[PDB]
Amino acid sequence: DKNGDGEVSFEE
């Protein structure tokens, strides 16, 4: 998904 930190950060 996209979050910013959750998913290996970096707005993944």
PDB file of N, CA, C and O in Angstrom:
ATOM      1  N   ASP A   1       0.840  -1.185   0.000  1.00  0.00           N
ATOM      2  CA  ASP A   1       0.000   0.000   0.000  1.00  0.00           C
ATOM      3  C   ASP A   1       0.885   1.248   0.000  1.00  0.00           C
ATOM      4  O   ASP A   1       2.101   1.152  -0.164  1.00  0.00           O
ATOM      5  N   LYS A   2       0.242   2.392   0.185  1.00  0.00           N
ATOM      6  CA  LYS A   2       0.957   3.656   0.208  1.00  0.00           C
ATOM      7  C   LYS A   2       0.563   4.437   1.466  1.00  0.00           C
ATOM      8  O   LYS A   2      -0.619   4.561   1.779  1.00  0.00           O
ATOM      9  N   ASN A   3       1.577   4.940   2.152  1.00  0.00           N
ATOM     10  CA  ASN A   3       1.354   5.704   3.367  1.00  0.00           C
ATOM     11  C   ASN A   3       2.455   6.755   3.515  1.00  0.00           C
ATOM     12  O   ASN A   3       2.177   7.954   3.528  1.00  0.00           O
ATOM     13  N   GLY A   4       3.683   6.270   3.622  1.00  0.00           N
ATOM     14  CA  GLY A   4       4.827   7.153   3.768  1.00  0.00           C
ATOM     15  C   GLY A   4       5.888   6.531   4.679  1.00  0.00           C
ATOM     16  O   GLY A   4       7.082   6.762   4.496  1.00  0.00           O
ATOM     17  N   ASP A   5       5.413   5.752   5.639  1.00  0.00           N
ATOM     18  CA  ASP A   5       6.305   5.094   6.579  1.00  0.00           C
ATOM     19  C   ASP A   5       5.926   3.615   6.686  1.00  0.00           C
ATOM     20  O   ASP A   5       6.796   2.745   6.678  1.00  0.00           O
ATOM     21  N   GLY A   6       4.627   3.377   6.785  1.00  0.00           N
ATOM     22  CA  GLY A   6       4.122   2.018   6.894  1.00  0.00           C
ATOM     23  C   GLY A   6       4.849   1.085   5.925  1.00  0.00           C
ATOM     24  O   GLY A   6       5.692   0.289   6.338  1.00  0.00           O
ATOM     25  N   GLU A   7       4.496   1.210   4.653  1.00  0.00           N
ATOM     26  CA  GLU A   7       5.105   0.386   3.623  1.00  0.00           C
ATOM     27  C   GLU A   7       6.526   0.870   3.327  1.00  0.00           C
ATOM     28  O   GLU A   7       6.718   1.824   2.575  1.00  0.00           O
ATOM     29  N   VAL A   8       7.487   0.189   3.937  1.00  0.00           N
ATOM     30  CA  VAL A   8       8.885   0.538   3.748  1.00  0.00           C
ATOM     31  C   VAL A   8       8.999   2.036   3.462  1.00  0.00           C
ATOM     32  O   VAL A   8       9.781   2.450   2.607  1.00  0.00           O
ATOM     33  N   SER A   9       8.206   2.808   4.191  1.00  0.00           N
ATOM     34  CA  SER A   9       8.208   4.251   4.025  1.00  0.00           C
ATOM     35  C   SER A   9       8.426   4.609   2.553  1.00  0.00           C
ATOM     36  O   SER A   9       8.104   3.821   1.665  1.00  0.00           O
ATOM     37  N   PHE A  10       8.971   5.798   2.340  1.00  0.00           N
ATOM     38  CA  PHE A  10       9.235   6.270   0.993  1.00  0.00           C
ATOM     39  C   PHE A  10       7.954   6.290   0.158  1.00  0.00           C
ATOM     40  O   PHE A  10       7.967   5.927  -1.018  1.00  0.00           O
ATOM     41  N   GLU A  11       6.876   6.719   0.799  1.00  0.00           N
ATOM     42  CA  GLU A  11       5.587   6.792   0.129  1.00  0.00           C
ATOM     43  C   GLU A  11       5.404   5.593  -0.801  1.00  0.00           C
ATOM     44  O   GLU A  11       5.162   5.760  -1.995  1.00  0.00           O
ATOM     45  N   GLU A  12       5.528   4.409  -0.220  1.00  0.00           N
ATOM     46  CA  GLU A  12       5.377   3.181  -0.982  1.00  0.00           C
ATOM     47  C   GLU A  12       3.903   2.780  -1.060  1.00  0.00           C
ATOM     48  O   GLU A  12       3.300   2.820  -2.132  1.00  0.00           O
TER      49      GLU A  12
END
